[PDB]
Structure formats: structure tokens, C-alpha cells
Symmetry: C5
Subunit: 329 residues, 5 copies
Amino acid sequence: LLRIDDHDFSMRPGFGGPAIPVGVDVQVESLDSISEVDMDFTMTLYLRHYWKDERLSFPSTNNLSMTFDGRLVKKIWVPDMFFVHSKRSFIHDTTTDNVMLRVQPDGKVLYSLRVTVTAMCNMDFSRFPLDTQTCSLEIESYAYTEDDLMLYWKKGNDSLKTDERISLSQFLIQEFHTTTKLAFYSSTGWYNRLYINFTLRRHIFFFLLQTYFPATLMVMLSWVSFWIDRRAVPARVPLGITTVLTMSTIITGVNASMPRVSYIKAVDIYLWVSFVFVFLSVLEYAAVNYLTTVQERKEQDTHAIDKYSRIIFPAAYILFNLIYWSIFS
Amino acid sequence: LLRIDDHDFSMRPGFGGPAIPVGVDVQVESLDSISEVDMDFTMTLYLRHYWKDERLSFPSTNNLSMTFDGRLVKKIWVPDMFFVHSKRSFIHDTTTDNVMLRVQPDGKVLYSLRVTVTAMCNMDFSRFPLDTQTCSLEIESYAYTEDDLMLYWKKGNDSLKTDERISLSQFLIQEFHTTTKLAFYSSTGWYNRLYINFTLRRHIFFFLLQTYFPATLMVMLSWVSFWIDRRAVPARVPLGITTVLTMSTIITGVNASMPRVSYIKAVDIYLWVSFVFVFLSVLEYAAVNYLTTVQERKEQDTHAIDKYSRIIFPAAYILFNLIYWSIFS
Amino acid sequence: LLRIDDHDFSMRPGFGGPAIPVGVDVQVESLDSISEVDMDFTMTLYLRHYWKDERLSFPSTNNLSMTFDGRLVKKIWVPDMFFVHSKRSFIHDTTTDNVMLRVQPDGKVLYSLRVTVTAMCNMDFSRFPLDTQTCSLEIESYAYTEDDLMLYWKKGNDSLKTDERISLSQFLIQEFHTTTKLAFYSSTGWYNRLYINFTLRRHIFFFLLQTYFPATLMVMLSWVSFWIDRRAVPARVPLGITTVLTMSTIITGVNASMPRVSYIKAVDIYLWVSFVFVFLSVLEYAAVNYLTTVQERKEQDTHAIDKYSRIIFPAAYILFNLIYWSIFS
Amino acid sequence: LLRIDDHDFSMRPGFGGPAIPVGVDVQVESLDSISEVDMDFTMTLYLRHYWKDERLSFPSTNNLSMTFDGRLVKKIWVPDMFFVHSKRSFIHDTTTDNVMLRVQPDGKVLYSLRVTVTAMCNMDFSRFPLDTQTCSLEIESYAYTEDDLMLYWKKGNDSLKTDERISLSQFLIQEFHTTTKLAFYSSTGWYNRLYINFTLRRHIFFFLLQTYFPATLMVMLSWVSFWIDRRAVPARVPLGITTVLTMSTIITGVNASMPRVSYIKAVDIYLWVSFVFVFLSVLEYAAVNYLTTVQERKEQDTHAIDKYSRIIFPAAYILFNLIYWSIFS
Amino acid sequence: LLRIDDHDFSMRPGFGGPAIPVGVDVQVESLDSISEVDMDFTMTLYLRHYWKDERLSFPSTNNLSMTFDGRLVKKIWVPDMFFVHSKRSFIHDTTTDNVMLRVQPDGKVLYSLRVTVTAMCNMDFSRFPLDTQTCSLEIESYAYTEDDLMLYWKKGNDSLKTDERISLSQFLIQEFHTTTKLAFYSSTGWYNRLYINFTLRRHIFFFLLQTYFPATLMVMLSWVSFWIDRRAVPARVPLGITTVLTMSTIITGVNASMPRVSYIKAVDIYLWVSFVFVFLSVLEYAAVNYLTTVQERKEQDTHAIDKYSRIIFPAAYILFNLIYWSIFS
Ligand SMILES: *[C@@H]1O[C@H](CO)[C@@H](O)[C@H](O)[C@H]1NC(C)=O
Ligand SMILES: *[C@@H]1O[C@H](CO)[C@@H](O)[C@H](O)[C@H]1NC(C)=O
Ligand SMILES: *[C@@H]1O[C@H](CO)[C@@H](O)[C@H](O)[C@H]1NC(C)=O
Ligand SMILES: *[C@@H]1O[C@H](CO)[C@@H](O)[C@H](O)[C@H]1NC(C)=O
Ligand SMILES: *[C@@H]1O[C@H](CO)[C@@H](O)[C@H](O)[C@H]1NC(C)=O
Ligand SMILES: *[C@@H]1O[C@H](CO)[C@@H](O)[C@H](O)[C@H]1NC(C)=O
Ligand SMILES: *[C@@H]1O[C@H](CO)[C@@H](O)[C@H](O)[C@H]1NC(C)=O
Ligand SMILES: *[C@@H]1O[C@H](CO)[C@@H](O)[C@H](O)[C@H]1NC(C)=O
Ligand SMILES: *[C@@H]1O[C@H](CO)[C@@H](O)[C@H](O)[C@H]1NC(C)=O
Ligand SMILES: *[C@@H]1O[C@H](CO)[C@@H](O)[C@H](O)[C@H]1NC(C)=O
Ligand SMILES: CCCCCCCC
Ligand SMILES: CCCCCCCC
Ligand SMILES: CCCCCCCC
Ligand SMILES: CCCCCCCC
Ligand SMILES: CCCCCCCC
Ligand SMILES: CCCCCCCC
Ligand SMILES: CCCCCCCC
Ligand SMILES: CCCCCCCC
Ligand SMILES: CCCCCCCC
Ligand SMILES: CCCCCCCC
Ligand SMILES: CCCCCC
Ligand SMILES: CCCCCC
Ligand SMILES: CCCCCC
Ligand SMILES: CCCCCC
Ligand SMILES: CCCCCC
Ligand SMILES: CCCCCC
Ligand SMILES: CCCCCC
Ligand SMILES: CCCCCC
Ligand SMILES: CCCCCC
Ligand SMILES: CCCCCC
Ligand SMILES: CCCCCC
Ligand SMILES: CCCCCC
Ligand SMILES: CCCCCC
Ligand SMILES: CCCCCC
Ligand SMILES: CCCCCC
Ligand SMILES: [Cl-]
Ligand SMILES: [Cl-]
């Protein structure tokens, strides 16, 4: 039916004359995973191409479109799109190649395939875990400049569809939209580039329960010391020390999970402030023991330091929390 | 024998006329693994196709079916099934391609191959580890709409078989059955989709032994304090503190294993209630030490708080357990 | 030399008449690894096939066998064996395909290739780490039933050889032997299946040193308390508590390594019995402190409980060990 | 258009006569990751080749360059570059091979492809984490010596371009430049080799916060003991011991991350000096307890050792820090 | 130029007559990694073959050798070497296949390719970490026996070269040399096998610092107890106990890294002897407390046990160290 043997499909339609227009539309099937340590994300999608080539015309009375096996795709000419700034990708091939080819009697062509992509995404963690991130996937022709191929979204803003099943356990996904821009390479020329854009917002529940609450509880334990008889030395001393040494484990277990960035994150601030609050309660009792011993040496109830600490330490931590959750909301 | 050179197998049987019927049946060989963190499962199966094509007719006197080498599959036309919402898959190929082709003299065809698939499955953990999950595998044609190909289960409900060796160490597997539904894609049309469905139920033994019992034992240790002379300050204080700090390790070691979901799981409730029970026993002894010191200051046996605590703490935990195992059964 | 262009090698020798006999023999090169968590093992082997096809006859005066390049294997007919219940496999291909083809003037054929296989193996851990396991590798034709192909061991029990270098660091390997059985698939028919069988036995040394000895040592530490003056409250109390909290770490570190099976293992029994032995020593001293305080209240040496405990705790643990190593030998 | 059928492209242009000149230029798209444990780095780049072959001449009136499909690359002759001392690499192939071919009417050729490479890099850690490292990527022809192929940078120092998005979370990247050298293989001859060179500098913030500060804080805790009444034996003893045992955990957690090199790193020096400072504070109190007991035995305030230690320990650590940060800056 | 179309390259040179001689030489580019847990090593190398085939003769006046594209390798006959006892391997293929073919007018051939190999190596750890290991890589023809192919080192002992950059962070590499031996397979015959041999020696610095020193320091801490007043019960008891419990962590952290072999390693001996030294110091103080209490009961300074222990424990450990480092040097 199609006269494949008659033509040289090493050359594009319109070769040696004006540029060929190629239109694109897309459906996203899933957003698969995200990594802070690698700074990337993985996506699976259906991708579709539209153009005309009169070398593929055939006669019929119905004027309708026809589907073909799929092994012909390797004989005819086809556009050459690639995913810019991507780490790895593949086309699915069970039970055969997941590819589709449809042709109309006047030579209009529709071409479709299913792919998975892993792509680069630069991330800012200064407000982590209360952060928002924005991401994009980039599409471009490899060999042909804007003088030979013209690339555009087939139906404007209606060219992107999304599966209703798409979900991530840790993020809310929002704000899917598409854009276009021109790109330049010094050695080879000017090219059209298409963009798919989206926004992510992290759920904080896990971190409250797993990090902010146990820090708070250690700080509240350190306050119990102020209500204990100053003469019980081997009770008041280890009560302070053990909370210092627990807080260090909390601080380590958080930071072991994240990339080694050169700046402070919002969670770091809270934990190190909590640490100094606990550390100071140890110096307070050392002072009261020393001054008691000086009183014994002069001579030979509750101390004013204890009396004031019962008031000052809790007020100060409440003030800190009010400020912190006013800044990070 | 088969006249392969005579025909154009880029076109389906019946091309330009009504739809071709294709029937399917399946045997599951193994259910290989499951992941909560990735929310997916892996399956290995045998998959079979049935249709008629008169271009493959041949003469004989016996009217019986004949087997062919397998290299012909790439010359003739074959249906184009794919696994919807799948992450990855392959066809096995040692010592050769695991593929089978059988043909009858009137052109009826049977085609079979062996494959492994990894597929998406959305999971709810609000009742974890006492949870039940349900799963499915989806099958569809890639290129041909219901106007060109008709896809159905070959023998109704008898079209699914399962290997007697199938097992998972952590789940009971039940309720294998099959269904059908129509699907729509905005750019390309309507398609028939087949479903394989099944249910999983988790064994709880591991979690009892590994999580609920040691929490319970920490709570019971904290009660020993109420039976110890109130004057033994450096004994009663670390006895409380060490149980607080152990309970925190238990809570961490559980949640380190699971995905970071935005809601509370049934195991979380038990551990955090156990934590407050242990935390309160520390505040109780602080109260008794303070009131004893006030009595010393006024002046200058067992305390009523100890007397009551010996009764109230164990009753309250028993009431909690009765309610919890009434809710989660 | 071989008349490859004359014949249609899509059809088996004897096509449309009786079954073709194919004989097999094997040499194992290595048993590569084993996993309890995945329940599988990996093996590398040489696999060999024997049959006659008169379409490959050629003339000569010597009556001897001749070797050919290996690229012909893809032109002639070849049997279609596959490994049943396998997870993955491949054929080696550096510096070329590791394949061999030898032919005699009357058309007898010898065919050989090198492969690695990973295969399923169901494991029972009720006696772990003192367990024994048994395993097998299964071989079958994919497309041809016993009416068209007949599959058998070429030399009976002498058909399996094993490399003298084969070893595993954790298991003793024994009892290599071969068997045969018929298999049935509802949709497709009856098939011959060959079996390779073997037995494994675990070395216990590592577990003695790494698990049973340190548990025993914690139990013996808890006994020291009975020899310490009952008035040293802040010594006798933490001596008990710290052994409880160490034993919990031992119990966790063992079970973190194994699959989450729904039944108790032989190592679990020993560790939880050791735990209750340590837990009871804490309740004993609580009793002696309480009764001493009652004596003080009445009034206002070694206690009989201490005196008896020095005898009863060690006897009871020795009785337990005698029973346990009588059961698990 | 191109007369591909006329010629034998198993032979280079100029075969049997002088060497063919081939020019190269490059753009780096990303520097992907780095490993101290494996001593390697990964890079993604665009690579371009320039030469003349009159067998590819064609007629035209415009004198302009033309682009071709990409399937012709496998028919014509092409240069044979490889990455020396590399571990693994690949060429990208979705949605097709990422390859470009452009030809001028006189037979000048431009050829381009996109690749990812992982390459060897020897690292020195004697100053870690305050270290600087230098790296290079090497390019060479596999089959052709300088007598048959001449390889050079196409535009001198202007032949290397870099993407403005390139970044690493842990390193500052600097000093990209290119060089050339001749190489010799004993069995096969002399070859031209091109070099891409660059420098890395590590950010220290993470290590200050994660390692140097908590060590310092343990040392400062050990000093509190000198301010506590010498008669409080069960307070002063565990205060020392617990800091010893914490410092050991710090030392372990650092070195667990790095390769097992045979020499000391700058971080090791700081932690082991901090350890002896803490260890000595335990021997000091043992001395004061012993001498007090001798005074009791003779007989039957603050001790001079305490008085001096309050001065000497902090001065000595401050002197150490001044020297250390003078050496490592 | 080469008459490739004239001949049947499914047959070796000399087919049906005497054996063809094939010579080999090698250059090692890198030794990439080593695993105790898997018992294997990885190597990257250049491998070269030499033979004569008159079917490849061509005319010329210069009598010099000529290089060809590389796509011809798949048309002509080539030898069939494989790596015996190997786990996996591949040939590199960016930017094309890393393969070289050179031919002289009389039909002498040189053939070369670049490969990476992972190979089996049995290891003995009885002296670990002071151990020495020896390794080899094995090379053989797959299909052809010594009656058809003769395989030898091309230049005797001069046939192996090594890159000056080769290094491992944990081992000293020494003693590279080559050997030959004949091998027999029962079903198929006799074959020539070539060997590459080498020796490794481990650096001990890491283990001294990471394992032997901290054990020693725990033992020295336990000795402090002997210098402390026997009446300070709640000081002397936890001082012993905490060192016992630290030593157990040291023992665990070492053995978690290695394979589970059925015999004792040299590091195990040192750590378990150190453990009993620490354990005995706890029983000593229990004895002194008991005998003091008996003296109190009879009645109703430093004890001789303390006096002697100050001398005996350190002498005994010094004697142990002298013996141990005399045995393991
Ligand atoms: C198809 O084209 C024919 C003319 O060739 C026209 O009559 C018919 O309406 C067209 N149908 C559609 C659906 O565009
Ligand atoms: C979609 O369409 C509108 C037309 O109003 C144009 O603003 C815009 O670029 C598109 N929106 C986005 C967010 O890209
Ligand atoms: C096969 O077809 C023939 C007629 O062509 C019929 O006589 C015979 O019964 C059929 N056999 C089966 C098993 O259907
Ligand atoms: C199988 O067959 C029945 C007919 O009674 C129909 O209910 C059902 O859909 C099938 N069952 C399920 C559970 O899909
Ligand atoms: C090979 O066959 C010939 C007859 O064709 C016979 O004489 C000879 O003994 C046979 N040799 C072997 C080894 O079987
Ligand atoms: C090997 O040969 C014997 C013949 O005595 C038969 O018992 C047996 O099946 C084979 N042995 C095993 C263990 O399979
Ligand atoms: C191309 O070549 C023609 C002569 O063949 C010359 O006139 C023209 O200037 C050239 N153009 C460029 C851009 O080099
Ligand atoms: C680039 O160009 C200069 C010419 O001044 C030459 O020094 C140098 O080799 C190049 N620079 C480097 C750093 O390689
Ligand atoms: C090559 O062979 C010719 C004879 O054919 C001889 O004269 C010449 O010396 C040889 N050259 C080398 C390098 O062997
Ligand atoms: C290399 O050559 C010598 C000849 O003296 C022979 O001893 C030896 O086998 C070779 N050496 C080794 C170590 O294999
Ligand atoms: C102690 C944790 C407080 C968390 C406050 C969160 C406010 C949205
Ligand atoms: C940008 C730094 C914010 C620091 C706020 C501290 C709140 C107590
Ligand atoms: C303390 C754990 C109790 C577990 C109860 C389980 C009831 C099925
Ligand atoms: C849906 C929340 C259940 C909470 C029950 C608490 C049982 C004590
Ligand atoms: C305390 C461990 C005893 C191990 C006994 C093993 C007997 C074979
Ligand atoms: C089958 C259970 C065995 C339990 C034996 C307990 C030995 C003390
Ligand atoms: C205690 C850590 C001091 C860090 C000093 C860093 C100077 C650049
Ligand atoms: C090259 C060794 C440097 C050691 C300096 C020590 C600084 C206190
Ligand atoms: C306490 C460790 C001693 C290490 C001695 C090493 C002798 C080469
Ligand atoms: C072969 C065993 C060596 C044991 C030596 C022990 C040295 C104290
Ligand atoms: C901005 C640096 C903060 C450091 C807090 C310890
Ligand atoms: C640890 C500091 C104490 C100072 C008391 C005046
Ligand atoms: C003290 C906690 C209050 C913070 C409110 C955002
Ligand atoms: C529903 C939130 C519960 C939180 C318990 C700490
Ligand atoms: C820690 C709180 C104690 C309050 C006693 C009245
Ligand atoms: C107190 C435990 C009883 C719970 C019964 C389900
Ligand atoms: C058979 C169950 C045993 C449980 C021991 C805690
Ligand atoms: C902890 C239980 C003690 C009971 C004494 C009679
Ligand atoms: C008390 C240990 C003896 C057990 C003998 C098998
Ligand atoms: C150069 C060796 C230093 C060792 C410090 C413990
Ligand atoms: C631990 C050493 C103490 C020595 C006192 C003279
Ligand atoms: C005492 C810290 C000062 C070091 C300045 C580099
Ligand atoms: C040879 C066995 C030694 C065991 C030491 C605990
Ligand atoms: C723990 C053993 C002590 C024995 C004293 C005679
Ligand atoms: C006491 C350590 C000396 C050992 C010398 C090899
Ligand atoms: Cl105490
Ligand atoms: Cl601890």
C-alpha cells in the first residue's frame, strides 16, 4: 500500500527548501520518584508527533486514517527529539516496542511512543523541611536548526494532559503548565525548546513527630532538675548530662539523611538552639554547688539561682518558639 | 510450508473492514516481591493469544495443529499488548527466546510467551501493621482501538490459572479473579482493558515480638519505682530516666523502615501512648521529693502519692489496652 | 561444506512424524551465592545437547567429527530448553558468544554453551541457625510436547559432573544427584522435566561466638548482684537495669538480618528465655528492699531471698541449657 | 544524493599515503557525581569531529551545508575515538540515537554525538576535609597511529565550552583548560592524546558543624569536674567516664565514611588529641582521691591539683587550637 | 582490497589438517576493586592475538602492515578466547567498538580489543588483618582442542606489561608473572590454558587506629578501679560495668564487616582476650565487697586483693602482648 521502495528517506520532507513544521502534545502517566541527594526526579509519559509527508500518500474512497504494524517506522523518515539535561531514559518494549503509526490518504502522519525519563533539578534547602520546589522537563531536536525544523505545541495550552492517579507520599503536586524558548549553541546554531513546568510542596507531619517533638521533650526534662534538693549531687548531675548526650544523637540522626550543603537549614537552627538550652542547665548546677561550698568554708532552703531558673528557662524557650514559628510559619 | 513471501504483514487481518477478535488466557508462575517504600509489586507469568489469519493456511490430511521454530514470529503479523501503569518488564531469552507458535491448517493461530512485570500499587497504612491491601495488573493494546481490535478473556472466568507453589513470607494471598472495562484517551480514542485482581493480608507475629512486647516491658519497669524507699534519690531518678530514653529508641527504630506518609499509623498510637505513661512516672517522683522537702522545712512511711500510684498506673494501662485491641481487633 | 541453503530449518527433524530424541549432560562450574531474604541461589554451568539431523550430513573419508565457527547456530535448527521457576539468566559473550558446534559426517550433532542462572528455593527456618536445606534446578522444553520431543539424561546417573573448586564460606555442600518427572499444563499439554538436586548444611561457629556467648555473659553478670550488700541501693539497682537494656540490643541485632517469617526460630527461644532470667533479677532486689523497709517500720546480715537466689538462679539456667541442646543437638 | 554505493568505506581517506587530520571541540553539559571510596567522577558532554572526504562530494548551486538523517553514519567511514582510563560510558538513544551528520558539497564533514563517561581520578586525603583535588579526561584514537591519523584541538584554547548550570553541592569548581601529549605503547606504536583539566575545592561548613564543634563541647564538659567538691565521688567519676565514651563514638562515626588509606588525615589529628585531653581528666581525679585517702590514713578545702587544673587544661587546649589552625589555615 | 567474498570463513585456517598456532600478549590497565564478602576482583586490560591466514593476502610493493576499519572483524574468521572461572565481563563500545585489525600482504594478522573482567579468588582470613593473598586470571579457547588450535605466550615472559598508574588504597601489589598448563574436560577433550598471577599485601595502619588501640584503652580504664577507696561502692561498680559493655560494641563492630567464616581470625583472639581481662576486674571487686562484709559481721586501709591486683593485671596484659606480636609479627 505505502510506496516505501520508491524514495530516499535519508532526507527530510522539503529538503533544500523551507522548514518543516512539527507539532507536539503529551500525557503524563506518573511522577515516579525524587531524590534530594542526587537532585533529580523520574517521570513516565506518552509523547506524540504530527506532520505531513506526501511521499506517504495513498488512494482510498473513505478519506479516513489507517493504522500500520510498527515495523515501518525504521524505513520512513521520523523527527529526532531528545530530552535536554537528562541523566538517563528508555523506550518500553514488552511485548513489543510501545510505538504507534497512523497515516491519512493525503500523507498526514501521527506518531506516538511511551517513555521513562530521569532529569536534573536544582534544589534549595534553606527552609527545609518547610520548603517549596519547582521543576521542568525540556524537549528539543538534536540535528536540525530552526532553519530546517519548526517545533511547537499542537493545541496551545491544551497540549498537556495528566493522569488522575498521579500521587507522591511526601509532596503535594500543583501548577502544571507549558512554555517555549529559543536556545543557542556556539558551534551549531539556534533551536526551539519546549518546557513542561510544575511545583511541589512537602508535608511536614513526619518531621514534627520525628524531630521537633523529641527535642522539645529533652528540653523539658532538663527543667526537672530545678525542683530537686541541691544536696542530691549524684542525682542532679547525671540528669543534666544524659539529656546533653541524647540531644547530640538527635542532631546526628537528622543530618545523616541530607546532602552536605554549605549553608544552614531551618531544622538545624531549632536543634542547635535546643542544645544550648540543655547545656546551660549543667553550668547552672555547677555554680550552685560551688557557691554552696564557699558558704560551707565561711561557716566552718532553696538557692536564689534555683528560684530564678524555675521562671527564666521556660519563659525564654516559649519566646524562642514564638519567634521561630513567626519566621517559618 | 507457510507462504510467508506472498503477503504484506504490515497490515492486520481484515484491514479496512471490521475488527479482529483476539482472545487471551494466563497462568501466574510467581508473585516475586513487594515494596511499601516504592509502592509496587513484581509478577512472573505465562501469557497466551488466540486468533485466525487465512494468510497462514496450509494443506494437510490430518487436520491437526503444528509447532514451528519461533524465528517466524518476526515475519508474520502479531497482536500488540502492553502492561498499563507498569514500571519495567522483560521477556526471558535463555537458552533462546521463550516464545511458542502453533498453527492449524485453516489458519487458526496460538501464540505464547513468558514475562516478568513490575507494577504500581497504591497502599493505605492507617491500620498498619494490621492492614489489608488489594492489587491489580492491567492489559491493553497499544495501537488499535475497539474499531479495529476486539480483546476478551478466552474462556470467561476460567481464563486464569495459578501455580500451587506461590507464596510470600509476610502475606497471605487470596481472592484471585478477572474483570473488564473500557478506557478513553482524548487524543486517540476508545480501548478494551483486561484486569487481574488479588488481595493480601499481613502476618502480625513479627511485630508483636519485635515492637509491642518490648514497649510493654519498659512500661512495666517504670512501675517498680513506686515500691522503692523515697529516700533513695540516686536510685529512683535514673530508674525513670533510662526507661524514657529507651522508649525513644524503640519509636525511632520502627519509623525508620516505612515511607514518610502524612498521617498517623496504628503502631504510632501505641508507642506514643506508652511514652507518656513512662514520662509521667518521672514527674510523680519529682513531686514527692519536693513535698518531702517542704515537710523538712516545716519540721525544722509511704507518701500518699506512692500509695495511690501503685494502683492507678497499672489500671489505666490495662484500660488502654482493652480499648486499643477492641478498635484494631 | 554443509548444505545450509537447501533446507527449511523452521521445521524440526522428523516434522509430522514421531518425536525426536534429545539427550543432555551437564558440568557445574560454581555455586555463586545464596539469599535467605530473597529465598534464591545462583549457579554457573556448562550445558550440552545431542541429536541427529540428516540435513547436516557431509562426505569424508576419515569418519571423524569436525568443529565449526559458531555463527552457523543461527541458521540451522536447535532445541529450545529453558530453566523452570527461574528469576533471571544469561549466556556469556566475551570475547565472543561462548558456544560450540560439532558435527559428524552422518549428521550427528553436539552443541554446548555456558550460562549463569538464578533460581527459586523455598526455605524453612524453624531450626535456624542449626538448619539443613535442599535445592533443585529444573530444565524443560518450551514449545514442544512429549509427542514431538523426547528429553532424557544422556548417560543416566553419570550425566552430572562437578568442579573440584566449588565452595561456600557458610555452608557444607553435599548429595548432588539427578531425577526426571512429567509435567502438565492445562492449555498446552504434557512435557518431560529434568532435575538437578543438592543439600546444604550451615556452619554454626559464627553464631556461637556472635550471639549465644554474649547472651550467656549478660545472664552471668546479673548474678553478681546477689553477692553485694543489700544496703548499697544505687549499686545494685543499675547493675540489674543495664543488663536488661543490653539484652534488648542483642535481641534486636539478631532479628534485623532475617526475613519476617510468621513463626519462631530456634535462636529466638534462647534469647527471650535469657531475657526473662535477667528481668527477674530486678524484681528480686525490689522485693528485698521493700521487706527491709517493712522491718524498719516495725523496729521503729543476708536476707533469705539473697541466700536462696545464689543457688536457684544458676541451677535453673543450667537445667535450661541441658534441655535446649538436647532438643537442637 | 550521496554516492554511498560506489566506494569501499572499510578504508580511510588517504589510505596508503599521508595521515588524515581530524579536529575536535567539546561542550560540557554537567559534572554529575564524585566518589572518594571509588576514586572516580562522572561527566556528560557533547563531542564534535571535523574532516574532509571527497567520496562524499555532491553538486549544488548554493555552496551551503546540508543535514542528513543519521542512519548513514553506519555506511560511511568515521573516526574511532575512545576515552582512556575510563571505567564505563554510553551514548544516549531516546527517542533515537543522539547523533548528527552535516556535509558540504566539497566533502567537508561535521559529526556530533552526546555521551556520559565515568573516569579514574587519584585522590590525596592528607589534608582532608581542607583538601584540593585536580582531575582530567583523556581522549585518543584506538586503531590508528600518528602515521595515519593526526588529532588536534580545532580552535586552540577556544575549543572547550561549559554550561552555565554546572554545580556540585560539596565542591567549588574552577580552572577548566585543555592540553596535548604524545603516548607510546610497546607493541603498537605512537599516538596523540588530548586532555581536559579542572580543579575542585571542598566546602568545610558541614564538617565544622558535624565534627569539630561536638568534639570541642565534650572537652569543655570534662572541665566542669574541676569545680565540684572532691567528696562527691559518684558524681565526679561518671562525669569523666561518659565523656570518654562519647568521644569514641565521634571518632568512629567520622572514619566509617572514608576509604581505608594507610596514612593519617587532618581530621584524625584533632579528634585523637581531643581524646587524650578527655582521658587525662579521669587520671587527675583518681590521683586526688588516692592522695586524700593517704591523708586520712595519716590523720587516723580545694586540693592543689584541682586548683592548678582549672588553669592548665583550658590554656593547653587553646594553644593546641592556635597551632592547628595555623598549620591547616 | 581484501577478497572477503571468495571464501567460507565458517572454517578455520588449516581445517582438516594440523593445528593452527595462535600467540598472545597482554597489557594491564587497572586493577579496579576487591571484595572479601564476594571473594572476587575486577581487572581492565588490553588483549592481543597473532596468526596467519593466506585467504587474507593482498598485493603491494611496500611490504608494510595496513589498518582496516573494524567492521570486517565480523566477516572473517577469528579465534575464540574466554576467561575461565569468571563471574561477568564486557567489551567497551563508546564511541564505537574498541577493536583493532591490522594485516600484512602475506596474510599475517594482528587483532586487539579492550575488556573488563570480574573473576573468582579464594581467600584465607586466619591471619586477618595481617594476611597475604595470591590471585590469577585464566585464559582458554572455548571450542577447539589442542588437536586443532595451539595457544602460547607470544614472547615468553616478556608477554605481560603493566600500567605505571596501577594502585589500590588498601593493598601493596607485587609479583606479576605468567604460566601455562593443560586442562581436561571429560566430555570434550584436552585444552591449553594460560595464567596471569599476582600477590597482594594489606596495610595494617587503619586497623591499629580503628580497633587495637581503643580495646587497649578500655583495658587500661578498668585498672583505675584498683586505686579507688573500697568504700565508694556506687563509683567502683559502674566503672567496671561500663567498660564491659563498651568492649562488646567494639567486638560487634569489627565482625559486622567480614564474611561469616567457620574459623577464628587473628583479630578475634585479641578482642576476646581483652574482654576476659575486663570481665575479671568486676569479679575482683565483688570479692572485696563480700569479704569486707564478712569482716563487719565478725567485728559486730587497702585490702590485700587490691594491693596485688595493682601489680598482677598490668604485668599479665604486657606478657600477652609480647606473645601475640611474636606470633603474628
Ligand atoms: C475526508 O475528506 C473528504 C474529502 O476527501 C471529505 O468529504 C470528508 O468530509 C472528510 N472527512 C473528515 C472526517 O474530515
Ligand atoms: C497559557 O495561556 C496563557 C494565555 O492567557 C498565557 O498566559 C500563558 O503563557 C500560558 N500560561 C502559562 C502559565 O504558561
Ligand atoms: C479436524 O477437522 C476434520 C475435518 O477437516 C474433522 O474430521 C476432525 O474431526 C477434526 N478434528 C478435531 C480434533 O477437531
Ligand atoms: C466471575 O463470574 C461471575 C458470574 O457469576 C461474575 O459475577 C463475576 O464478574 C466474575 N467474578 C468476579 C469476582 O469478577
Ligand atoms: C567411523 O566410521 C567408520 C565407518 O564409516 C569406521 O570404520 C570407524 O571405525 C569409525 N570410527 C569411530 C571412532 O567410531
Ligand atoms: C541413580 O541411580 C539409581 C540406580 O540404582 C537410582 O536409584 C536413582 O534414582 C539414582 N539416584 C538418585 C539418588 O536419584
Ligand atoms: C561558498 O562557496 C562559494 C563558491 O563555491 C562562494 O562564492 C561563497 O562565498 C561561499 N560561502 C561561504 C559562506 O563560505
Ligand atoms: C592556553 O593558551 C596558552 C597561550 O598563552 C598556553 O599557555 C596554554 O598552554 C593554554 N593554557 C593552559 C593553561 O593550558
Ligand atoms: C618486507 O618484505 C620485503 C620483501 O617482501 C623485504 O625486502 C623488507 O625488508 C621487509 N621489511 C620488513 C620491515 O620486514
Ligand atoms: C619466567 O622465566 C623463567 C626462566 O628462567 C621461568 O623460570 C619461569 O617459569 C618464569 N617465571 C615465573 C615466575 O613464572
Ligand atoms: C514543639 C513542636 C511545635 C510544632 C508547631 C507547629 C506549628 C504549625
Ligand atoms: C535568616 C535567619 C533567621 C534566623 C531567625 C532566628 C529565630 C530565633
Ligand atoms: C502486649 C502485646 C499484646 C498483644 C495482643 C494481641 C492480641 C491479638
Ligand atoms: C481513629 C482514631 C482511633 C483512636 C483510638 C484510640 C484508642 C485508645
Ligand atoms: C553458651 C553457648 C553454649 C554452646 C554449646 C554448643 C554445643 C555444641
Ligand atoms: C518445639 C518447641 C521446642 C521448645 C523446647 C523448649 C526447650 C527449653
Ligand atoms: C572549634 C571549631 C573551630 C573552627 C575554626 C575554623 C576557623 C576557620
Ligand atoms: C605534618 C604533621 C602536622 C602535625 C601538626 C600538629 C599540630 C598540633
Ligand atoms: C596496642 C596496639 C599495639 C600495636 C603494635 C603493632 C606492632 C607492629
Ligand atoms: C594458632 C593459635 C595461636 C594462638 C596464640 C595465642 C597467643 C596468646
Ligand atoms: C550562621 C551560622 C550559625 C551557626 C550556629 C551554631
Ligand atoms: C563551670 C563554671 C562554674 C563557675 C562557678 C563560679
Ligand atoms: C508556644 C507555641 C506557640 C507557637 C504558635 C505558632
Ligand atoms: C492526630 C495527631 C496525634 C498526635 C499524637 C502525638
Ligand atoms: C517538675 C514539677 C514538680 C512540681 C512539684 C509541685
Ligand atoms: C489486657 C490485655 C487484654 C486484651 C484482650 C484483647
Ligand atoms: C510460641 C510463642 C512463644 C512466645 C515467646 C515470647
Ligand atoms: C515490684 C514488686 C515488688 C513487690 C514486693 C512485695
Ligand atoms: C551446661 C552446658 C552443657 C550442655 C552440653 C550439651
Ligand atoms: C603519625 C602517627 C600518629 C598516631 C597518633 C595516635
Ligand atoms: C590511676 C593512677 C593513680 C596514681 C595515683 C598516685
Ligand atoms: C582559639 C581559636 C582561635 C583560632 C583562630 C584561627
Ligand atoms: C578456638 C576457639 C577459641 C574460642 C575463644 C572464645
Ligand atoms: C561473684 C563471686 C563472688 C564470690 C566471693 C567469694
Ligand atoms: C608491650 C608492647 C611491646 C610489643 C613489641 C612488639
Ligand atoms: Cl550514685
Ligand atoms: Cl548508653
